[PDB]
Design a protein around this ligand. Structure first.
Ligand SMILES: [Mg+2]
Length: 128
């Protein structure tokens, strides 16, 4: 009952992209877009708003080259006016970097490595 969702995953680690994609597919997601950095992420969101192929949810790796997840999240929130959930993927969450994430406009976070339970929880909490 979740094949209606369209999900964007921004992750600069290709092994990680495959892992999260497989998890999302196992949960029933069929509409998935991968972004290798924050610049690609911004580009994909802009298109989705224009074309009514809107993303229901974004998973945003915090640390990526060229444009990181924090900069991408700020652009997506404030420039593109995207107001749906953005979930940070973080290798390390401490007081300083969490405040930075929240200030960027993140809706929540998962510490890497992610588990299927984390995906299920995000879906029920944000997209029920
Ligand atoms: Mg990364």
């Amino acid at each position: 009952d979740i094949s209606h969702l369209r999900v964007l995953v921004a992750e600069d680690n290709l092994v990680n992209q495959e892992v999260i994609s497989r998890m999302l597919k196992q949960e029933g997601i069929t509409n998935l877009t991968m972004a290798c950095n924050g610049a690609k992420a911004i580009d994909f969101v802009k298109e989705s708003i224009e074309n009514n192929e809107n993303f229901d949810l974004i998973f945003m790796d915090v640390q990526m080259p060229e444009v990181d997840g924090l900069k991408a999240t700020k652009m997506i929130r404030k420039n593109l006016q995207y107001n749906k959930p953005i979930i940070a993927l973080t290798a390390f969450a401490d007081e300083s970097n969490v405040k930075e994430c929240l200030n960027s406009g993140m809706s929540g976070f998962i510490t890497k490595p992610i588990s299927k339970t984390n995906i299920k929880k995000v879906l029920v909490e944000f997209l029920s």
